[PDB]
Swiss-Prot record, chain A:
Domain of life: Eukaryota
Organism per entry: Saccharomyces cerevisiae (strain ATCC 204508 / S288c)
Misc note: Present with 3280 molecules/cell in log phase SD medium.
Protein name, per record: Kinetochore protein SPC25
Cellular compartments annotated: Nucleus; Chromosome, Centromere, Kinetochore
Family the UniProt entry places it in: Belongs to the SPC25 family.
Function: Acts as a component of the essential kinetochore-associated NDC80 complex, which is involved in chromosome segregation and spindle checkpoint activity.
Record text on subunit structure and interactions: Component of the NDC80 complex, which consists of TID3/NDC80, NUF2, SPC24 and SPC25. The NDC80 complex is formed by two subcomplexes, TID3/NDC80-NUF2 and SPC24-SPC25, which are joined end-to-end through their coiled-coil domains. It has a rod-like structure with a length of 570 Angstroms and globular domains at either end. The TID3/NDC80-NUF2 globular domains are probably directed to microtubules, the SPC24-SPC25 globular domains to the centromere.
Span within the parent record: 133 to 221 of 221
Swiss-Prot record, chain B:
Name of the protein described by the UniProt record: Kinetochore protein SPC24
Subcellular location: Nucleus; Chromosome, Centromere, Kinetochore
Subunit structure: Component of the NDC80 complex, which consists of TID3/NDC80, NUF2, SPC24 and SPC25. The NDC80 complex is formed by two subcomplexes, TID3/NDC80-NUF2 and SPC24-SPC25, which are joined end-to-end through their coiled-coil domains. It has a rod-like structure with a length of 570 Angstroms and globular domains at either end. The TID3/NDC80-NUF2 globular domains are probably directed to microtubules, the SPC24-SPC25 globular domains to the centromere. Can also interact with MPS2.
Miscellaneous note of the record: Present with 1750 molecules/cell in log phase SD medium.
Family note: Belongs to the SPC24 family.
Record's function text: Acts as a component of the essential kinetochore-associated NDC80 complex, which is involved in chromosome segregation and spindle checkpoint activity.
Length: 89, 58
């Protein structure tokens, strides 16, 4: 069922989309990994919405941001985000 | 509803999950063409997913 695929989607992607509710549209990417790590950002609009919760140093939020705007390959971003979330452990 | 947005994300990574046979389908953007991976307990299914996903990045 739709819930069954969604379970395999999150269970194996260790990535969940948590929209921020309040008054402005916001997307919070959450990585399911004990330390619980997440970054706030969206491909829609952009505002002071700047929150980062990795588990090592700001360099992650830095290289991760420069990576998406510099590579233009959203694949190298989620792919490097995974390898980066691991290095934090 | 937003289900299409989530599938659009994983689909953007070049992954095409399919429960029509408990298997994950895949597409290699660089060189290669299409690839398939069956779901199995194996030793570390989590590592297998990080394997195709690391290669999909290329």
């Amino acid at each position: 069922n739709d819930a069954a695929e969604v379970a395999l989607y999150e269970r194996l992607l260790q990535l969940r989309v948590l929209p921020g509710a309040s008054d402005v549209h916001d997307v919070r990417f959450v990585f399911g990994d004990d330390s619980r790590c997440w970054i706030e950002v969206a491909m829609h609009g952009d505002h002071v919405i700047g929150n980062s919760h990795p588990a090592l140093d700001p360099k992650s939020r830095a290289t991760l941001e420069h990576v998406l705007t510099v590579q233009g390959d959203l694949a190298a971003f989620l792919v490097v985000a995974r390898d980066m979330l691991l290095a934090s452990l | 509803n937003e289900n299409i947005l989530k599938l659009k994300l994983y689909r953007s990574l070049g992954v095409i999950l399919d429960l029509e046979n408990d298997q994950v389908l895949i597409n290699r953007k660089n060189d290669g063409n299409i690839d398939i991976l069956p779901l199995d307990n194996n030793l570390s299914d989590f590592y297998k997913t990080k394997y195709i996903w690391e290669r999909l990045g290329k």
